[PDB]
Amino acid sequence: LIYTAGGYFRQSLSYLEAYNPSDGTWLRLADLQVPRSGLAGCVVGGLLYAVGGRNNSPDGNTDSSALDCYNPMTNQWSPCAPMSVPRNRIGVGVIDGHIYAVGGSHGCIHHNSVERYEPERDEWHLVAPMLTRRIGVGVAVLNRLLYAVGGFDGTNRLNSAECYYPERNEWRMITAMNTIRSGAGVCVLHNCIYAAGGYDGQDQLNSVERYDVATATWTFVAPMKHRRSALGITVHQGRIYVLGGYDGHTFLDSVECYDPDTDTWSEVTRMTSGRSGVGVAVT
């Protein structure tokens, strides 16, 4: 199922809801213990993780350094060790069963730092920083390499992307995207890195482009129906699913689905309530 955790509508949310693309059902599961938006989600060893974010509420606006783990067999959240700094609008990718936390903000500070979590030791350790400060950064893993794509450096929104080599622990810039995108959905489908939607400083985007490693080229594919930034994104059964977001006026419940073979986006479901800034993963 596609799990979405957290998000924002009027305040940061605790929701954990799981969608079944088979029967179209929405399952409601255990609440996050602390609300959070601008987090990221991943899955390691069959356990679902919620990383960073912040709790934006009527009584505070606290950036989160928290790492929290949901077991689909127990329906229970458990705390893990926290990151070295709070990271709102974080990006995460999974390499070799390790969780990489990328960028994000703490107050005015826009991080270029990166750190790596070892689930079997429940510890974080800092790795090499990105070349660019990036919040609202999209992160994807391809051929055991970590890509940081787009985002916002505190002043400029970014079309640049860079690549992390775990064996050499160093970052290398790659070809920039055709479009500047902060708060896009960034995943890997088959063997391209996809960047969908985002915000370019003036408008939310519906365009979608994909990166081909061998040619180092970004190409546009079919656009989504609805422009959106701060969306969740995941891959389910060779399909791309994007969930919610913000279009400059409204918080979307729309869930769109990209069929790569037809190069077509379809409306597949609505979330139970519109929201932005969710964390999403599959298990």
Partner: peptide, 9 residues
């Protein structure tokens, strides 16, 4: 509002 996420700033 944050123009990107919709959150109250």
């Amino acid at each position: 509002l944050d123009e990107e996420t919709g959150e109250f700033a």
